[PDB]
Ligand binder design. Sequence first.
Ligand SMILES: Cc1cc2nc3c(=O)[nH]c(=O)nc-3n(C[C@@H](O)[C@@H](O)[C@H](O)COP(=O)(O)O)c2cc1C
Ligand code: SF4
Ligand code: SF4
Ligand code: SF4
Ligand code: SF4
Ligand code: SF4
Ligand code: FES
Ligand code: FES
Lengths: 121, 209, 29, 114, 147, 216, 80, 460, 78
Amino acid sequence: SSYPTNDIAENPYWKRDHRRAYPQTAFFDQKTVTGLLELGSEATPRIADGEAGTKALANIANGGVSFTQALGKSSKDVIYGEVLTVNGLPPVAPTLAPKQWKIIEGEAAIYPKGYPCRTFH
Amino acid sequence: AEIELTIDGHKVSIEAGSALIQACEKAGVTVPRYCYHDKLAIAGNCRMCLVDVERAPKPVASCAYPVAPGMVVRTDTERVKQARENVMEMMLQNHPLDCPVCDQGGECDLQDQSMRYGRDRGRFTEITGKRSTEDKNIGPLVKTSMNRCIHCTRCVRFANDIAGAPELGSSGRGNDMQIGTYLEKNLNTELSGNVIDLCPVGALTNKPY
Amino acid sequence: SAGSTAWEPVGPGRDDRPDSFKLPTPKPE
Amino acid sequence: GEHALRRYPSGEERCIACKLCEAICPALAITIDAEERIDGSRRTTKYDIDMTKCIYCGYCQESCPVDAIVETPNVEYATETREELLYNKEKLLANGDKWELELQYALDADAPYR
Amino acid sequence: VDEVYEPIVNPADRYLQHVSDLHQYAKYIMAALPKYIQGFSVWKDELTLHVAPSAVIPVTTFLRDNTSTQYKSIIDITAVDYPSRENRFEVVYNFLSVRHNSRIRLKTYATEVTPVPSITCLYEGANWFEREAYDMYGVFFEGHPDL
Amino acid sequence: HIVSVHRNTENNNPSIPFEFSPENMKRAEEVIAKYPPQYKKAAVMPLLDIGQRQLGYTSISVMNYVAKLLEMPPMRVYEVATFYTMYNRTPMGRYHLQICTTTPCQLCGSDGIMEAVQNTLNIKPGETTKDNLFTLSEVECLGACVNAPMMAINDDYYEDLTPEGTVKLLEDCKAGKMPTPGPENHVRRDCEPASGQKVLLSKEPHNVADFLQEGI
Amino acid sequence: WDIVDVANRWENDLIGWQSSGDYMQATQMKFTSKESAIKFANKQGWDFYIQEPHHRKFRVKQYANNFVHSYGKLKHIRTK
Amino acid sequence: RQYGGLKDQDRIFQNLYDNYGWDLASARKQGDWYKTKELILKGDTWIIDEIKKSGLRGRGGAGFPSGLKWSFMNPPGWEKNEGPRYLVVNADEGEPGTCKDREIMRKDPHKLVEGCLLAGRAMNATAAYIYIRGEFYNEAAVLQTAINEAYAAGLIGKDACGSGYDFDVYIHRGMGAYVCGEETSLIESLEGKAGKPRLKPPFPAGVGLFGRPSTVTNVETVAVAPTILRRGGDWFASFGRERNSGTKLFCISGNVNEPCTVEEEMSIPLRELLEKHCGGIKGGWDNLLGVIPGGCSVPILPKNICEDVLMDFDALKDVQSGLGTAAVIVINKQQDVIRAIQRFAAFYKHESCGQCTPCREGTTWLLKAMDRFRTGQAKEREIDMLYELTKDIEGHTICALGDAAAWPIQGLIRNFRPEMETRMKKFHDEVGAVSVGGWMKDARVEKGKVVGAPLPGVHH
Amino acid sequence: DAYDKVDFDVPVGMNGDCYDRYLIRMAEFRQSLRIIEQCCNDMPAGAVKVEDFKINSPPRNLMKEDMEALIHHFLLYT
Ligand SMILES: Cc1cc2nc3c(=O)[nH]c(=O)nc-3n(C[C@@H](O)[C@@H](O)[C@H](O)COP(=O)(O)O)c2cc1C
Ligand code: SF4
Ligand code: SF4
Ligand code: SF4
Ligand code: SF4
Ligand code: SF4
Ligand code: FES
Ligand code: FES
């Protein structure tokens, strides 16, 4: 066993029920992304207050403003920072655990110098 | 006339005076139960329907608490989950390890709701052991293994209200309370088999099957 | 497969979208 | 290896017809039928294993809550006919009565780990 | 060892930054190809791009030749039957970039009689996979040399 | 432990007849009058006690007779007679010793009293003597916790006990007149401190009529 | 799929297993809605019968109704 | 201001010790039944407003303000309900330590009867039912004699005291149950059923006894009331702190030198009640271990708190306890506090009605664990386990008996934990090691029983 | 699983031939031996399956003494 799971007093199952705390699958159609573009996000809001912003969202929930329209209408500071990077470059295919390779040569290698197979750490 | 209320953020509407569990069923919200049945009277003894209402300090029974206008219910939060865990702990305190030899296995509400709303392991290890209860003979149709009774009172309510068989009752007091005929009597009615289906445990079972 | 569970096994999951990709709630007033 | 139905030291048979081995078996090799015995006990009237379906995985031996179905260490039971590999209740009980000592060695070594 | 200590941790918490990164990446792809990308979806280091059959060859060319998205290895092509949908079969593609060490998924739809474009023109490895999808599900890949 | 199952015996089974005497039937009708006419089942408790006093224990025949009188099913009466512990559903002795063992009477010496009674009668709680004279039962608090330790013999409270006094109390209840209830040997009257009253020391009370309001 | 009588189940004479000739006796498709099922059935050319579902009827349920006042003779004595 | 000097000029329950007899003529001298006709003719609202002005609170254990709960029976439009309206008196006295209502009903019955009449007038009641313990046989006989005196004197029944208010008074005898003191189980026992408590909603003021309006009050709460109406409310408010008004009957019991029932003003200090109205503690003050100030349904107090604590509702709640039935049970250092708490556990096991799951199973579990903690056949983490067990009961119940069964173990674990750890060390040294549940290495099921270790509490 | 907690090298070859694949596989033999050494030296203590009995079977001595354990065994195996 292990301690915090075998404990008999301060160990409710709902605090360690990781199966039922599973992450949802997020889905983004084109409507939901022009909302993030025309309006903003919860991190960078660009939406009016009250019912005005409510029906501003509703104008996107239905086909009011399109995705291409929102891209054309988008400023430099929106694209360069929320679509492309701050430097204007596109984002690369992300890596969860980046692996930087190193080549082992000489005496600590598997095969000597002549052979056509190398050693990568 | 219908009213309006909120359950887990969802707004739903049912007639006034209705029970909260009915609102949760209309809203598609699943609430546990052992002693509530749509066709039997409301008993509030299992204490498994507990939910959180902003009005009330303590968690209240969905089966019995009336529906009111503007009430806000949560069936999700930590108090409710802990309550369900605690109630199943107590429910399975004295329950017998009869699951292989029990004919309700695979279609038991106790099993499924322990897996869903309860603990993974028990903390009952007392050397004095569990309670025991003797088996009753109520006829050739209903077989009794009454160590498995969880004291829901569905059988009694059915027999006394829907069937007109007042011979079944609740004798004793406390942990030694026993469902049955206080003396050896038969459950004489032409509707007795629905007791087998109403019991969410295998305390009352089909004898030829 | 007739012995499939009659009770819902796993609830809704956990929202793990970042705040940059949740639509903005407008301020109340 | 070869399958066996065990008994208690009473001589009574351990199996209680719970049908968990029938349910977990990936190959559907187990076939069971049961009813109420004359003395009121939950016991099997039919217990069959098609060895020609079985994959020898041990899921039945893991599932049993009474240590009734087990797998012996035997592999030397090849036959000339396939009708001899459709083991029934009497075959399995005789096999347990035959292999109980080997099964007891194995259990005394293995049960803490399962 | 007297007591074994193992902390309680959610396995999904390890993914959050990468999830945000994949979201941004998918946003870029959607903004670069708004004619083709119907949607995207993200779950635990897995990005799926949601397109139509007409959009297979363009999007795959983009995912093969663009410098930031160098998905050069075909991993798998599969189909999934959802008989409740009007377009019952969902044709799934799995791609790997050994350059950037990243995986992507692309999904289209099909019927028993409506075909999908073959990506053998781009990935020779797709031949046998598309054949298997036909054999198991009946999805016809138009452009395939020997189906 | 509470017994919740009945097994028929030759002296406790529904074939045995039971009937209130005319005195007890008059009293029972007076008791039924104390509730609304349609809710006569409310009298199930007092009438069952009337039966338990006529015949020395609540037998199944008593329950069934009460059920016949009040037009209620017998099981509703069985539930009452099993719930409430003063209904003795086994036959009893002449004298029912009820000794409290709750915490006050324990702090003040109930266990000495229990030892004394068990040694004198050679009996354990829940059992009866050979004489059909003493039935012993350890009970919860009987509402005499200031005059502790305590006991009760067939409805009367003997209080502020000692092992000596309990032994000779049992002696004289075994044969001859039994003392009057209350504290043992009049070392106290009632709830007064045993040194003496410290509060209510006059010989004429204050009439509240002398201290009314300005109104009324 | 509905049963065909001659091919559904029969006992084997060797060891007593239940043999079948019907190759659709364990198949069960699951759909999201009635209409999708009907569309799929018609596309595959299957004749079908739609068994509509019977839902419980709503009725108000009060805990207080277990303890209401009886002006006349008690209809029945309630346990709990 | 400092409290605890109640003069006999200010004592409601004269005849608490049987110096001026109980029959009607004596009570007439005492002022009972003096001007009750004109009090009845003042009306509902004046009586309720005077009982509110008095600050009278519940004497049964829950200190809810009276008058308010008497006013719940008089909403707008009660006349069109068209049926009887009942008052119920909670003369049940199951609260281990509590003796006060006995000494009200055997030594001042006419105060109780007049209180029934006046509270029924206030709540517009047609009859009063008094629910007395079956073990209180002779006290019930006294109160029945007094009710008969009042019926023959024209003071109750048709045109009570010469007014136009009809009112009857009946005695019901409960044949043994501590749960029947609960508000709704009382009602169900009066209705001819097993005394299993009901849920709330419905509330007894709407749907109570026989489906009619009902209000359950303590004997003391009604017995005092005529004196508060006659003497003037503000008088009753002259005692105690701001929200803890009045006098209170205190039964002091246990390991005190002269166990007594006294009547002192509220917010009296506990040390003063023990030293001045009793003999002090048996063996000296610092020989005190703990005091239980409100009966078994209240957690124990350690010595550090009892030196400057006032006997009220508010303060005793401020120290995580309560003023219940004002029964002070004193414990010495020579005693085993664990035995006290495990006996209260056994009490709540015997007295559980057996209806709802947590009390049903948890009282048994708590007793099984406390039987082992008495002997030390446990572990140190099982104390925290037991605390969680009490929390599995403390809010998931129909009635408050589960809370009353959870609270004393909490008090013990809060104030007397090293005693438990010492007992467990003593067991580990004198007998042998132990596992979760009281199991030992040699403990086995041999021939239908556990043989290799002690089994606490089993007597059957 | 644990390859982030054990040291091994990866063989990579030029020329894409079968000789290079053979040399790669022999280097992989030797690196697997390295990993096996490290795992035999650094094998930790504790459980070998998740301690959530809603996903994994409980132990038998709990399945034969605890009610929740037996319920979970039954459901996981049926
Ligand atoms: C288990 C339990 C027992 C109770 N026993 C009594 C009792 O023996 N006597 C009493 O007058 N109040 C008792 N009460 C309090 C209530 O039942 C009820 O009397 C109510 O609090 C009275 O309101 P009051 O204080 O304003 O008079 C008890 C409550 C519970 C939960
Ligand atoms: S009633 Fe359910 S949980 Fe209890 S033994 Fe039977 S199958 Fe198992
Ligand atoms: S016998 Fe069955 S139906 Fe009746 S109360 Fe017990 S568990 Fe419920
Ligand atoms: S071990 Fe053999 S008989 Fe048992 S489930 Fe596996 S394949 Fe079937
Ligand atoms: S062999 Fe074991 S698992 Fe299979 S039915 Fe018998 S007892 Fe159950
Ligand atoms: S808490 Fe106990 S006494 Fe109260 S209703 Fe529940 S089982 Fe009965
Ligand atoms: S369903 Fe509400 S307590 Fe049982
Ligand atoms: S504690 Fe014994 S009479 Fe109450």
